[PDB]
Amino acid sequence: YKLARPYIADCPNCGHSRCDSPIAIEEVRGDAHAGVIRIQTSAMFGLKTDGVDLAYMSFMNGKTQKSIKIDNLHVRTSAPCSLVSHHGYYILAQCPPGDTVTVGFHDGPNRHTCTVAHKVEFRPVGREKYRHPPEHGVELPCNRYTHKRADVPFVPVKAKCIATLAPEPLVEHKHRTLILHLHPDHPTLLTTRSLGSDANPTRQWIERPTTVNFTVTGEGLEYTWGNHPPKRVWAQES
Amino acid sequence: YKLARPYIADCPNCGHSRCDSPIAIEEVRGDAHAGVIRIQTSAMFGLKTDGVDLAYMSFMNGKTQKSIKIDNLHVRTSAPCSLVSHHGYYILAQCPPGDTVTVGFHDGPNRHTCTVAHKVEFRPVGREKYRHPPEHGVELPCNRYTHKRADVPFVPVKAKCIATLAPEPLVEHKHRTLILHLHPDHPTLLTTRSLGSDANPTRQWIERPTTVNFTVTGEGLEYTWGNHPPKRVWAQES
Amino acid sequence: YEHTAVMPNKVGIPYKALVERPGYAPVHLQIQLVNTRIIPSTNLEYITCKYKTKVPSPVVKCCGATQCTSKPHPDYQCQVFTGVYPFMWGGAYCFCDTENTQMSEAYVERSEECSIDHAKAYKVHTGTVQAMVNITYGSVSWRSADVYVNGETPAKIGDAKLIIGPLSSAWSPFDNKVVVYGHEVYNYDFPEYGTGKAGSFGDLQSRTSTSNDLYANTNLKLQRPQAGIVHTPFTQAPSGFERWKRDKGAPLNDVAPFGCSIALEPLRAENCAVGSIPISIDIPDAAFTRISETPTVSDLECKITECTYASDFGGIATVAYKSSKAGNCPIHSPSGVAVIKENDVTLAESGSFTFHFSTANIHPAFKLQVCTSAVTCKGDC
Amino acid sequence: YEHTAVMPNKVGIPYKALVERPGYAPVHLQIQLVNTRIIPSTNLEYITCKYKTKVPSPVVKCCGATQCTSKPHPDYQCQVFTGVYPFMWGGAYCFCDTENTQMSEAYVERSEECSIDHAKAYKVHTGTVQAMVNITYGSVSWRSADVYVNGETPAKIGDAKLIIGPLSSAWSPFDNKVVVYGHEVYNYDFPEYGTGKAGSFGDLQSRTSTSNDLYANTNLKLQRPQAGIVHTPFTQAPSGFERWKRDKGAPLNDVAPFGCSIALEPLRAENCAVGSIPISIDIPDAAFTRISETPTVSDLECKITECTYASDFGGIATVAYKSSKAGNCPIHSPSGVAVIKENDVTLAESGSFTFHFSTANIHPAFKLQVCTSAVTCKGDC
Fold this sequence. Notes:
This is part of a larger assembly, with 2 copies of chain A and 2 copies of chain C.
Chain A: E1 27-29, E2 36-40, E3 45-48, E4 51-60, E5 65-68, E6 74-76, E7 80-87, E8 90-94, E9 101-104, E10 113-116, E11 138-144, E12 157-163, E13 170-173, E14 177-182, E15 188-194, E16 202-206, E17 210-215, E18 221-225, E19 228-233
Antiparallel strand pairs in A: 1-2, 2-8, 3-4, 4-5, 6-7, 6-9, 7-8, 9-10, 11-12, 13-14, 14-17, 15-16, 15-18, 18-19
Chain C: E1 2-8, E2 14-19, E3 27-49, E4 51-54, E5 59-61, E6 77-82, E7 101-110, E8 118-137, E9 145-148, E10 161-163, E11 177-180, E12 185-186, E13 204-205, E14 215-216, E15 221-222, E16 234-235, H1 240-245, H2 252-255, E17 261-263, E18 268-270, E19 276-282, E20 297-306, E21 315-323, E22 327-329, E23 338-340, E24 345-347, E25 354-359, E26 367-369, E27 374-376
Antiparallel strand pairs in C: 1-19, 2-3, 3-8, 3-18, 4-7, 5-7, 6-7, 8-9, 8-11, 10-19, 11-12, 13-14, 15-16, 17-18, 20-21, 21-25, 22-24, 23-25, 26-27
Membrane topology (chains A, B): Single-pass type I membrane protein
Subunit structure (chains A, B): Processing of the precursor of protein E3/E2 into E2 and E3 results in a heterodimer of the spike glycoproteins E2 and E1. Spike at virion surface are constituted of three E2-E1 heterodimers. Interacts with 6K protein.
Protein name (chains A, B): Spike glycoprotein E2
């Protein structure tokens, strides 16, 4: 539980010559379309002796049940991770690569770190990648978790996740032809299909200023660009 | 536990200058091809002052809500009815149609009866319509009621309930042809089909010693001979 | 070893065959389709069931109009009738004449029995077919395997490994719309889920019976109030479900041609004898013996001791022979007048091997085959 | 008055027509397909989703047999290995080798994100097709109405009572077996819950994969236990769900040749350009003349102020005239290079009517007809 203290658990592998550690990870969620991972494990962040906090953790060090302020004691996946929220039994962190989940104490004479293998992937829900939402670009659906302690448990939900935007898509209308001068600064998936009884069935990932001419039968075309909300025309002016 | 108790009530049909009666009924279900009837009464058996018994009733007999053992509160269709189980609010007795259930006081030279009419739909739903349960022969589709209490109402059920019959047809298999020498003492619905691939969809009602020849595929045939559900015969040649 | 045969769907009747293979001693094969269940995917369209009409006492307002209050009961119908009762008696005492108004309401509900004493409107789309396929290989007649007849998984169950190439329905006595009585099916069309109709099946409609969700038409038609009493009179034409209920001639459950005993919850046709089921039968070498260059069977004669025609397996007959080596030989007769049940004969000289056969002819004359020797058998049925 | 017309799903040309009736001047009909939702009924066959891998510590019995015990999980796989590790602890782990036996176990589990990052296998039974059919009468347009194809939901808007019969083409990438991931739909085969799929969707199978105790075919093949570490090693064929998700090189959503935005749950193809829509349209009698065609239109000239080359309704033009009597008169142009949006003009002795028109040509020369008299209009598109 959230208020229940960490305990030793099977994982007889650490990077030092002491390996009598906690951590075995009861459950993990990280099959999100966000970048964040919710971990349920013994070696609990979000729990000190005061119960549930947002910036303190507790752990068995290998044999020492205690709490500390987060110093040189780091969560990682396949890369360092800076936590986002701590919720007792649950850890919540931003961990960009995912996959393996590593909780470790990088203390002195006994330096334990357990890693547990898991399939934690961050993938498109549409066709735009997610692996670490920034704060710049269009918000789009994703799976995520609540990011403040409810002491209820952290469990999957869907929230909104930022994904990169691209420069102005310069459209040029002509007769029965729509050339799209597109100017990505970043990988955009350009999908087109006509909004006529014709088609433009062209998926391509594009980067950098290019032109792409498409047919229009007199019923325009839909082009989704970057998996950002579609830019669509229905005219024969297109 | 029942939430209602008996009361004096104006009867739907009672003898004139006696319509200001005690003992009355609310609703009855008789949609069953079962001989038993489920009653929602206000002249309740299965209710004493203590609630549910199996051989006690309560009534407001032009008196007050009080109980005695079955004696003065009688169920009838228009002739006696013997209860099977009492379940508080709902009573169960056999009064076969369930379209007429009569609660009546049968003491002294006078014959007092209140009778209640009900909104039952008793229809075919089986493979044939048939006589109410006797003791003899094989059952046929019914929609019986539970015959014990759970203390509130008896539950609706579909099962099969008893039917009279007479000696089953003397079957003779011979070259691709099956004669059924029949001896009904009672009307039987005879339904046939071959079970090989020959349709023979033949309904007939039969009574009296007669013969009925049927074709066979040589790969069995069903003859259902009323007051039984499908009976089937088979062989390399039938 | 795989031997591929096609067995007729004859419920309880084995389709007798000989498995011939050289460099081995041929194996007894009778495959009996014990049961075929065509089970199709069921979209419940609606429940319809035996309603109970409820006629409550009508709301009469003396000296004022009465307005109907709708109630969700399936074919709830009201009508407001004005000027019902003049000064004093008329069926109610009222001072006012024209201002007296009765709202006459009545309705149908579900009865208490309406979820088990109900008919069911089902749409049927393509199914799965299970088949209980009893495979005899050698003397032992129980190498039986349940096997999907539809395309899912091969039977590796049973000692005789059966694959039935795909067949989603071997015969559905269920059309796009099929009516179930409550256990019996009649193909009968009706319009999809909604409000009932008093001229077609489904006088109450909606995918559940609760007398709220149920929307019905039973043709309740209010009539002018009774004169001498306050009452709600109505006429109706027979409900479409009720008209359908009086149709019970020749249900597919009792008349379907192959003995398809239609059973209900997901609709399915149990114990059909429809079609023939391709069976690829893994009959191992263990029900044969190596070669028949020395498990040769020679100087064979058949005497039939007894037979009964028009029986399942009323033939009893004996083969005397000499064999040069022991084996397992199929004693099958692919004759049409008799086919052998126990299509196996334990080769080993003894002058008698008793094989059981099935017949359909008054004289049992079948050409009986062991591995290498063929004979003609004779007796009297 | 019923007039039954069929509108092309083209917003380039909204399909303009005239409703004739004897002793009357025609009625404005302009029909635009605003939105199309092809919605079929979906019966879920199975879930497939992102698993999370669980690696437990393996049960090793030193100097004794260990047989695998099934522990139910979606891709539970074990293999029993004897000779697990070298002799003694000088080569690591256990005295014995021959007697020493390890069950090397590992599995995949559900994430609780198998309900929000999963694809869905659907069997598809017969649907409904919506067409949002906008029928314009006079300057008023909006009568834009969806109607279910099954005859269960007709548009009973009085001035354009629309029943939408089956659309000539209804874009369904919702075939017999269809997998939908997100918006992205892929036609992909699957059994009801039969054989596994490895290196494609059906990596996890079962009607829910947000629970454990499933059937998988990720094709995990355990290798001989590595010596010097407690580990359960494996080789595998590629993870099929993820591989199938990465086989987006043309999902039907993204190549939809009608520009349909495929959306998930009953499944639907939103805002298509698919087909032509049968419409039975109840024309309002109010949009014809009084009782007689009796308007006469005389002394006409037509001026086009603007047009845009081949447009939805980019034509703006005015026809000046003198009109007599009163009716409701058609201001349509039957021509093909332009058809007029406005197909009614409220005749009441009107002398100027500004009409909006649609074209499919780079020049607007259309013959526009008023009640009686017609002229030709010109400008530039």
